[PDB]
Amino acid sequence: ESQPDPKPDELHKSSKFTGLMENMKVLYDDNHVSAINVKSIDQFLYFDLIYSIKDTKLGNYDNVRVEFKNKDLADKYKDKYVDVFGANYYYQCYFSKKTNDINSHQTDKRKTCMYGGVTEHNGNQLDKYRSITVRVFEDGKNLLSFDVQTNKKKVTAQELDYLTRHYLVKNKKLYEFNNSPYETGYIKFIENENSFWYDMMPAPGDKFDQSKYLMMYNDNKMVDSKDVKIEVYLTTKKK
Numbered sequence: 001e002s003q004p005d006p007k008p009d010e011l012h013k014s015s016k017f018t019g020l021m022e023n024m025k026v027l028y029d030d031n032h033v034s035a036i037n038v039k040s041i042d043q044f045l046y047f048d049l050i051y052s053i054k055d056t057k058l059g060n061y062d063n064v065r066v067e068f069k070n071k072d073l074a075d076k077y078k079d080k081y082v083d084v085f086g087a088n089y090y091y092q093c094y095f096s097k098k099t100n101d102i103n104s105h106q107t108d109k110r111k112t113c114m115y116g117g118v119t120e121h122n123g124n125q126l127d128k129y130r131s132i133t134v135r136v137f138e139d140g141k142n143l144l145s146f147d148v149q150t151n152k153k154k155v156t157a158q159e160l161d162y163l164t165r166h167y168l169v170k171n172k173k174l175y176e177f178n179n180s181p182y183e184t185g186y187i188k189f190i191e192n193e194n195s196f197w198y199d200m201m202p203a204p205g206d207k208f209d210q211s212k213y214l215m216m217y218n219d220n221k222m223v224d225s226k227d228v229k230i231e232v233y234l235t236t237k238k239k
């Protein structure tokens, strides 16, 4: 485990955020992007890829913009059958406008954006999900453990993160409309020597930036499902 742990004063305090926690809840509520064996159909900027992913429930989106850290990543998956899974946003999302004679555009009707969340489909599949155990701690005590599943040998930290946080919002009320019963909290993935963590709470302020928050996912960090272990440490809002 090496990525300097969070020192208690490092983490964001939910109390210090005074603006609709619902904007944070939604990214991890039931909805999300998920498609398997899709290939990019267009591009907007040199660091993104446009996918034809259909919102098979509420019909909210017809196309999806996956944005990356750099051209490399984008190039690595251009015209490659991949699986997609990630938390999407809309409010600050925009792309293409229409296939122009200048701008490399596409997309007719309903858009949504997301960062990373791409893995090769071909040869990264399992018949029989694998189980990653999540050990949540509350003020130091391992007072809960649940299983997250995946049929990918190489799974993105984003998928595991959404999976974990999704369960906590349901069962522990991690994120509520205007609040959170928690003061701090963070998710830590452990592979071997490797370990990194994400901050689950929004930065101080009267508002939250979905786009800027989700952007940390743009490195498309991957991990081995047969090696990870997830741990959440949540401190309680001084009751």
Ligand SMILES: CC(=O)N[C@H]1[C@H]([C@H](O)[C@H](O)CO)O[C@@](O[C@H]2[C@@H](O)[C@@H](CO)O[C@@H](O[C@H]3[C@H](O)[C@@H](O)[C@H](O)O[C@@H]3CO)[C@@H]2O)(C(=O)O)C[C@@H]1O
Binding pocket: 041, 052, 053, 054, 061, 062, 063, 106, 107, 108, 109
């Ligand atoms: C990759 C891609 O096709 N992107 C389209 C999407 C998808 O088709 C949509 O998300 C469905 O999953 O939306 C748009 O596609 C339509 C557009 O190209 C128009 C142009 O004339 O043709 C449509 O054909 C439809 C037709 O409208 C229906 O009445 C018919 O019953 O079925 C046809 C195919 O389903 C395209 O679907 C869109 O404008 O809605 C644009 C994106 O480029």
